[PDB]
Design a protein around this ligand. Structure first.
Ligand SMILES: [Cl-]
Ligand SMILES: [Co+2]
Ligand SMILES: [Co+2]
Ligand SMILES: [Mg+2]
Lengths: 75, 76
């Protein structure tokens, strides 16, 4: 299954995922393509913030869903 | 010879077919009626997926048999 992530540059990347992957698994896949560490990633879907221990299916994230990556700065 | 084709939402299409029609021939008749490419179609009769290359009679599909059309999610 493929999903898309609108990254910090505004470009779009594609991830190979499975329906039960956690948000932290997704974050790991994002750090591989983009070089943003997971602790600094905030993932947003249908306007909503996604939580680490929940799964894609928990949010009914299906194939070709786009997630939006935002920097989490905790200064 | 007539058969019924049922979709996921329970819509029913009727097809005019022949006993020796191939499964490819049936997919082509569904393409004509519904506009779905044959490559996106899976056809099931009595729980069994029908295979390209085989005929209606290979599966004992007779007048008034019902087939279920399952669509390949387009790409993924
Ligand atoms: Cl015919
Ligand atoms: Co007839
Ligand atoms: Co009768
Ligand atoms: Mg896949």
């Amino acid at each position: 299954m493929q999903i898309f992530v609108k990254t910090l540059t505004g470009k779009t990347i594609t991830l190979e995922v499975e329906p039960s992957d956690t948000i932290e698994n997704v974050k790991a896949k994002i750090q591989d393509k983009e070089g943003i560490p997971p602790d600094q990633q905030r993932l947003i879907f249908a306007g909503k913030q996604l939580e680490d221990g929940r799964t894609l299916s928990d949010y009914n994230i299906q194939k070709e869903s786009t997630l939006h990556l935002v920097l989490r700065l905790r200064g």
